[PDB]
Amino acid sequence: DAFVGTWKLVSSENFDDYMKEVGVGFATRKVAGMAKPNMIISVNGDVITIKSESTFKNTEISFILGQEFDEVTADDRKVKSTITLDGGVLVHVQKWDGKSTTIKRKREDDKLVVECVMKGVTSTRVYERA
Ligand SMILES: CCCCC[C@H]1CCc2nc(C3(COC)CCCC3)c(-c3nnn[nH]3)c(-c3ccccc3)c2C1
């Protein structure tokens, strides 16, 4: 389907502001800001796996749509995550400390477009097939 593949980050807008809003400290934002991860999405039956791979940080989640799971994020938050498919978009909410953030992954033409929202801050990251 639309999401399976290896997707290399090619553009990012407002990610520093987004990380700051989430609570990431300056030193960590500095390393992240310049990073160009690959996002590797695969599916096996009911289980979707998403890996992010980069020089300074690798992460992986596996999940079933609509089933809450515990996630340790790249920035070491311990969150409760739920991912659903709504109108073709993978909508990922992370909840922690009465806070939330959403990560929406959408397929647009040749691109994987990822919108991250924390309060009034929105970051848009575009990835293209490796
Ligand atoms: C180098 C350590 C940096 C730690 C700071 C953290 C800050 C939060 C954060 N959030 C995300 C997303 C948002 O999730 C809330 C962005 C859209 C997908 C998930 C990503 C990411 N994953 N895949 N693509 N972008 C990364 C990240 C991971 C590896 C390299 C660069 C950035 C980081 C790094």
Q: Domain extents for the chain?
A: 1-128
**Which residues have any ligand 1 atom within 6 Å of their CB?**
19, 24, 28, 31-32, 35, 37, 39, 52, 54, 56-57, 73-75, 101, 103, 114, 116, 125
DSSP character string of 49-78: EEEEE-SS--EEEEEETT--EEEE-TT--E
CATH topology of domain 1-128: Lipocalin (2.40.128)
The burial class, CB within 10 Å (0-12 / 13-18 / 19+), for 71 is buried
- Locate 4 and state its tokens: 């399976």
Ligand 1 center–CA 127 separation, angstroms:
13
Q: Are 122 and 17 in contact (CB under 8 A)?
A: no
* Protein residue with least CA distance to atom 5, ligand 1: 75
21: number of Cβ within 10 Å: 19
Q: Beta strand pairing status for 89-96 and 99-108?
A: antiparallel
Nearest to 84 by CA among 76, 93, 75: 93
Nearest to 113 by CA among 90, 79, 80: 90
Specified resolution (Å)? 1.2
Give the Cα separation of 81 and 66 in Å (integer): 9
